[model samples]
Target chain A: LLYCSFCGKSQHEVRKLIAGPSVYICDECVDLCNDIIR
Target chain B: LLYCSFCGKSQHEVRKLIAGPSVYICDECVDLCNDIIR
Candidate 1:
């Protein structure tokens, strides 16, 4: 199965899809990143 | 530029993009998550 080659979060819709080798991430971390970016 | 919006890391091709309000993640976290999964 195509899991999140990065976080290995099962690669679910909530986790998003992977683009390259180090792409793909989970929602929880996404939110954190957004906050930081903002 | 589009930031990671997850781990506050710069959103590079390695970090991938966001799918929704709760999607997207950083490569480092992704790697850690992968290790846990493994």
Candidate 2:
């Protein structure tokens, strides 16, 4: 049931999953973050 | 020198930090993700 808290994509669906203190994020979401930041 | 790859904030600056494969994100950045996502 682990999934990306950002995009709501399951772990198996994403290329990578990074865990946070109380949330999780996927690689695609990470790319989106980069895009939004700069 | 470990800083948020998203907002470029250092661990001492941000409230919380989440580590990824080669990047790190902060709680504020995570909030930004939620805002950008849905």
Candidate 3:
């Protein structure tokens, strides 16, 4: 299963974001990212 | 949204286990655990 980079949470979802060669961003952590980016 | 302590996999499942006052174990990890214990 894909794991979230920030919080280490994993689940089968569209939240699995390929941030790099082998990194993912779940929806919850993605919220933190969105807050940081914009 | 419960997260597994061993693998950090989070999802709505019967795998949700309260290992301690503040710890959880999901079915995937529980499978590993079951193997180890038995």
- Whole-model lDDT per candidate: 0.47, 0.60, 0.43
Runs of candidate 1 with Cα error greater than 4 angstroms are A1-8, A13-22, B1-38
Most accurate candidate by TM-score? 2
Q: CAPRI verdict on model 3? A: incorrect
Per-candidate TM equals 0.28, 0.43, 0.31
Across B1-38, the per-residue lDDT of candidate 1 in tens digits comes to: 34443455654655354333433454555555555544
Q: Write the per-residue lDDT of candidate 1 for residues A2-35, one digit (tens) a residue.
A: 3443345666654344343434554455445546
Query: lDDT value for candidate 1?
Result: 0.47
After best superposition, candidate 1 residue A22: deviation in angstroms? 5.2
DockQ of each: 0.08, 0.09, 0.02
Q: How far is candidate 1 from the true structure (C-alpha RMSD, Å)?
A: 11.6
Cα lDDT tens digits for candidate 2, A9-37: 77668656655444467657656765665
What fraction of the native interface does candidate 1 get right in terms of contacts?
Answer: 0.03
Cα deviation of A15 in candidate 3 (Å)?
9.5
TM-score of the B chain in each candidate versus the native B chain? 0.40, 0.58, 0.45
Ranking by lDDT: 2, 1, 3
Q: Write the residue-wise lDDT of candidate 3 on A1-38 in tens digits.
A: 54554556644555333332323334444344444433
